[PDB]
Design a protein around this ligand. Sequence first.
Ligand SMILES: *[C@@H]1O[C@H](CO)[C@@H](O[C@@H]2O[C@H](CO)[C@@H](O)[C@H](O)[C@H]2NC(C)=O)[C@H](O)[C@H]1NC(C)=O
Ligand SMILES: *[C@@H]1O[C@H](CO)[C@@H](O[C@@H]2O[C@H](CO)[C@@H](O)[C@H](O)[C@H]2NC(C)=O)[C@H](O)[C@H]1NC(C)=O
Lengths: 48, 48, 45
Amino acid sequence: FKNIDGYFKIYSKHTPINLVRDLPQGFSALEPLVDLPIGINITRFQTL
Amino acid sequence: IAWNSNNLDSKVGGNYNYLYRLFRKSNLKPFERDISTEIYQAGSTPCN
Amino acid sequence: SNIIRGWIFGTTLDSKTQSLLIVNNATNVVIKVCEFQFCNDPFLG
Ligand SMILES: *[C@@H]1O[C@H](CO)[C@@H](O[C@@H]2O[C@H](CO)[C@@H](O)[C@H](O)[C@H]2NC(C)=O)[C@H](O)[C@H]1NC(C)=O
Ligand SMILES: *[C@@H]1O[C@H](CO)[C@@H](O[C@@H]2O[C@H](CO)[C@@H](O)[C@H](O)[C@H]2NC(C)=O)[C@H](O)[C@H]1NC(C)=O
């Protein structure tokens, strides 16, 4: 998630895994998903 | 692009539909919109 | 099991300023920019 010059930019990627705990190793580049012209001052965030 | 619109937006009594921001703690960022209507505190002694 | 459903981004999150909601409800993906009075503990059920 990025916030630059009035644009909120989102990149993402999905991966199949088989584990129980701990963020896994490896490499995978995220691709552009969306670019929203919201024009607000984000400083904090909260997960739903 | 800018053009004069006296015929459309001027009223003989006075057209008060159009508004601007005269006070902000800090300058805006590029392509940021501020619609907040919060009583601007000039000095000390908070306003409530 | 699709527990994480979205996010809210903002400054004060209390309807004096504008906030961004990105939520995935059971049927749609909803993106809104409004003046929200968010709950202190938001969640889905
Ligand atoms: C974006 O919002 C932040 C937080 O509301 C502003 O930063 C605050 O600015 C006030 C003074 O105006 C300070 O007292 C706070 O300590 C600041 N907090 C943080 C976390 O920085 C910031 O000025 C806003 N930016 C714009 C361009 O309005
Ligand atoms: C997920 O959110 C969408 C949009 O907020 C809901 O769709 C709306 O539902 C109301 C209530 O029936 C309708 O009046 C609107 O026309 C719908 N908007 C659409 C379809 O774009 C949807 O119902 C929500 N899903 C759940 C499970 O609550």
